[PDB]
Amino acid sequence: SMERYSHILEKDKREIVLLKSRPCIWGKCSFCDYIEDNDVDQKENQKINDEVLNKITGQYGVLEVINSGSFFELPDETIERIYKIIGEKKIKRLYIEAHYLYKKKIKALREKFKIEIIVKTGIETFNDEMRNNVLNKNIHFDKIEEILEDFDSPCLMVGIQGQTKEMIRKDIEILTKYFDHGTINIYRNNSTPIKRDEELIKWFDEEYHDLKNNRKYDYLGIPTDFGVGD
Numbered sequence: 001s002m003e004r005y006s007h008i009l010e011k012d013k014r015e016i017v018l019l020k021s022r023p024c025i026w027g028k029c030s031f032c033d034y035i036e037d038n039d040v041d042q043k044e045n046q047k048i049n050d051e052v053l054n055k056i057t058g059q060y061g062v063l064e065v066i067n068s069g070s071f072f073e074l075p076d077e078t079i080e081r082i083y084k085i086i087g088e089k090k091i092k093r094l095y096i097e098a099h100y101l102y103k104k105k106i107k108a109l110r111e112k113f114k115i116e117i118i119v120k121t122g123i124e125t126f127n128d129e130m131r132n133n134v135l136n137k138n139i140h141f142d143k144i145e146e147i148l149e150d151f152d153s154p155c156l157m158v159g160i161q162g163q164t165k166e167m168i169r170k171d172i173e174i175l176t177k178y179f180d181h182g183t184i185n186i187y188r189n190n191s192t193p194i195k196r197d198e199e200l201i202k203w204f205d206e207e208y209h210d211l212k213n214n215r216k217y218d219y220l221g222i223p224t225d226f227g228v229g230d
């Protein structure tokens, strides 16, 4: 079965859980097959999720919740249990993920949970045409500062056919200038038709080696590097 509970042991050490949610409200990104873990039956998702949530201890004071979609697609009972656990285990910082289409719901979530929330979002690349015409993310912003109104931490994807060195260089320039957290995901081939560019990945691995050790940004050479998921 799938690993759903682990610890992140570098940089901002924390517990992480990979939970089940109803279908991603977008669900059409050309490269994504994590949504295979979605399920329409929220009562079964809640039962599965509750066994994972029992493992949270708050031992680092920091927790990350991911769920192959956005936080808001979790069962209502899962969300309210996470809220309970935050208070009971004295957790002071929570990471969640939400697609940009949920931007306007973030403020109310922050006000409900009260603690520091780091909201991650799957920008993938700041290049508009690659993001929306190739990766089909449906993420539209006019200025970088618009993202920062509600999101804290862009997930970036590196190493996809159709990218260029210039495109990747600009993404890292933007990440490092504007954002206080972020995630660098080296692309992994999967069941979708979107494929790794091995030459770009080789180049990035050597040219941006100093990124691996940058305290602000999590770096995943393989998607399983947090210890959850297949």
Ligand SMILES: C[S@@+](CC[C@H](N)C(=O)[O-])C[C@H]1O[C@@H](n2cnc3c(N)ncnc32)[C@H](O)[C@@H]1O
Pocket: 031, 032, 033, 034, 067, 068, 069, 070, 097, 098, 099, 100, 120, 121, 122, 123, 124, 155, 156, 157, 185, 186, 187, 188, 189, 190, 223
């Ligand atoms: C649940 S999504 C992000 C949250 C939200 N649904 C969104 O898209 O904005 C998880 C992230 O994993 C990364 N990812 C997906 N497929 C990948 C792959 N094949 N290789 C590397 N990273 C991948 C992407 O950066 C994606 O944003």
Ligand SMILES: Nc1nc(=O)c2c(CN[C@H]3C=C[C@H](O)[C@H]3O)c[nH]c2[nH]1
Pocket: 018, 033, 034, 035, 036, 037, 066, 067, 068, 120, 155, 183, 185, 220, 223, 224, 226, 228, 229, 230
């Ligand atoms: N279904 C499924 N969901 C996943 O999230 C996943 C992962 C790790 N994805 C994480 C890595 C960086 C992002 O923060 C986060 O989305 C590996 N295998 C998986 N399978």
Ligand code: SF4
Pocket: 024, 025, 026, 027, 028, 029, 032, 033, 034, 035, 068, 069, 070, 099, 122
């Ligand atoms: S990358 Fe995010 S928005 Fe796109 S299908 Fe996957 S979980 Fe849904």
